Ligand binder design. Structure first.
Ligand code: 5V6
Ligand code: ZN
Ligand code: ZN
Length: 585
């Protein structure tokens, strides 16, 4: 395997020849270990607390989930722990018949996805514009430097020769240039999947790319109208670690639809950075901290450009295979059979495939499936055999589905149908409230001024106004944060990296105006475009639902907090200084 990965290791070895060594106490069992070199410790044992959000959410100072989120270890100790538990495993190879069905389904799926769109290369200017409209950091400085682009051209020339020299995945200025350059090249060859929305619902049927969190609930409610069995939402245990060599070969089939110049570069990403990979991971030792150089031929690199799209692809494929087994199209004998008859698989795909894709909502490893009946609950032979073993359940125990789309978990949320005072219905996203408060209380990094902290707090408050306004405690805390932070201060940083986040809260525009735009004007499931003129007409969950989902409403500590909130707002204001503030209470 050194013929593909050798050059990359050689450059790492030569760059760190001062401290390069083969550690014999290295813990890698399924990854090939190449060597180590000394580094300085990266990450922290805990996370920095947002004092603005914390001062305005006092009742949650005594909440266990809120305290757990304040932790999260990112040190070389924390890295090694998660690695041992998840990453250092081997997925048994699927059976010959399973491999055949997967190949037939992948070919059909790629042709269906490419029926209107044609693959294309992504550019230097697209990558630049994206980096620009994100930070405005060191990534924007590299994009601005012509010497970074000349390193890109040189690595590209190697890729055209079927070689790689610096595309290394990470679990001072030269190494940063090689990392960003590796990501640019991946984006150039596979970025079209994201940039041209191959996984939009109109293009993929099952996909939800570009839809946004506030649209996911409406999609689940539309799926519920399709005749069939229950709605299933099974969680795979560590999806990225279950991506097999057979999955990678099926994913690669997209190169068949590419122009010759694009195919060569995409083939280079697939063969050299997906099907072979060189990975850097930190590790503590009695001597200090080391960086290990490891490699393998399968699994998915979590941080890559193609990750979301290719996980969505393989999960759509895997769920269609499970649907076929549920329908009796695929038997136990079929999966073991190398000479499995292609005809009934092709017939099912050509006659039912698209209708079956419409019964699903698939976002990377997250899936919701409404099969034609409940035989799907016990259709586990292919799912387990493909390596997509469900999390925290015996392997052969039937899946439990839901007969109400409002109970279905999808993308860390569930969704409620609300009735507004004017009789119109809204479908809103929701999750346990402690997870929302616990996240907002976290500031990312260190050395942040009260202004930056207050502005991130404002971002969280405004996200709650737009997505979670239906939670009494979050509307109150949101109003308190926005009252404590100067009106003209622009929310900074980000509340989430989710593909489902459109960041409509990253503004100084009136939140009720933005609310109306999102939930009324631009909402395709809102036939009546009558604007809501007051927050008084913006609904809450029913009190019992709010409580079932974590509200502290009805508690004394909460009644005391609500009563005394103008005092805490005033305290934050007095520390921020002589700025313009608006009272939202
Ligand atoms: C499906 O949308 C999500 C999924 C998870 C998360 C949590 C996180 O990324 O910290 C946030 C969102 C989200 C998206 C728009 S507002 C909040
Ligand atoms: Zn490379
Ligand atoms: Zn809820």
């Amino acid at each position: 395997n050194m013929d593909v990965i050798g050059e990359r290791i050689k450059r790492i070895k030569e760059e760190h020849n001062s401290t390069w060594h083969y550690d014999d106490e290295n813990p890698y069992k399924t990854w090939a270990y190449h060597g180590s070199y000394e580094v300085k410790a990266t990450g922290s044992a805990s996370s920095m607390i947002n004092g603005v959000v914390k001062l305005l959410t006092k009742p949650w100072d005594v909440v266990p989930m809120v305290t757990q989120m304040a932790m999260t270890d990112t040190t070389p100790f924390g890295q090694q722990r998660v690695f041992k538990e998840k990453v250092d495993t081997r997925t048994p190879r699927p059976l010959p018949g399973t491999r055949k069905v997967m190949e037939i389904t992948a070919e059909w799926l790629w042709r269906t996805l490419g029926r209107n769109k044609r693959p294309r290369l992504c550019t230097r200017e697209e990558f630049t514009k994206k980096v620009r409209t994100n930070a405005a950091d060191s990534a924007k400085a590299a994009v601005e430097d012509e010497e970074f682009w000349k390193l890109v051209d040189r690595e590209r020339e190697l890729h055209k020769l079927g070689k790689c020299g610096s595309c290394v995945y990470n679990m001072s200025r030269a190494i940063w240039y090689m990392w960003l350059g590796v990501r640019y090249l991946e984006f150039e060859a596979l970025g079209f999947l994201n940039e041209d929305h191959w996984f939009s619902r109109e293009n993929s049927y099952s996909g939800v790319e570009g839809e946004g969190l506030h649209k996911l609930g409406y999609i689940l409610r539309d799926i519920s109208k399709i005749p069939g069995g229950a709605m299933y939402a099974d969680d795979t245990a560590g999806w990225d670690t279950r991506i097999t060599e057979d999955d990678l070969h099926n994913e690669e089939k997209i190169i068949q639809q590419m122009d010759p110049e694009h195919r060569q570069l995409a083939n280079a990403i697939f063969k050299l950075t997906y099907q072979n990979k060189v990975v850097k991971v930190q590790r503590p030792t009695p001597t200090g901290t080391v960086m290990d150089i490891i490699s393998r031929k399968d699994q998915r690199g979590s941080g890559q450009v193609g990750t979301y799209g290719l996980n969505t692809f393989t999960n759509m494929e895997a769920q269609l295979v499970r649907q076929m087994e549920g329908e009796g199209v695929l038997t136990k004998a079929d999966l073991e059979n190398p000479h499995l008859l292609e005809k009934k698989i092709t017939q099912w795909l050509e006659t039912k495939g698209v209708e079956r894709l419409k019964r699903m909502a698939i976002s990377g490893d997250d899936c919701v499936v409404k099969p034609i009946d409940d035989r799907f609950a016990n259709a586990l032979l292919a799912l387990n055999d493909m390596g997509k073993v469900r999390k925290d359940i015996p392997q052969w125990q039937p899946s439990k589905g839901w007969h109400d789309w409002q109970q279905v978990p999808f993308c860390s949320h569930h969704f409620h149908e609300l009735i507004m005072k004017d009789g119109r219905k809204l479908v809103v996203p929701c999750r346990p409230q402690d997870e929302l408060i616990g996240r907002a209380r976290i500031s990312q990094g260190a050395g942040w001024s009260l202004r930056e902290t207050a502005c991130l707090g404002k971002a969280y408050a405004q996200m709650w106004s737009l997505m979670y306004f239906h939670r009494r405690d979050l509307r109150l805390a949101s109003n308190a944060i926005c009252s404590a932070v100067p009106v003209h201060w622009v929310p900074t940083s980000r509340t989430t990296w989710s593909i489902h986040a459109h960041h409509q809260w990253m503004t100084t525009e009136d939140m009720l105006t933005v609310w109306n735009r999102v939930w009324i004007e631009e909402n395709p499931w809102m036939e009546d475009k009558t604007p809501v003129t007051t927050w008084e007409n913006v609904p809450y969950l029913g009190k019992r639902e709010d409580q079932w989902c974590g509200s502290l409403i009805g508690l004394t500590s909460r009644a005391t907090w609500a009563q005394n909130i103008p005092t805490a707002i005033q305290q934050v204001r007095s520390l921020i200084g002589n700025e313009e503030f608006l009272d939202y209470m």
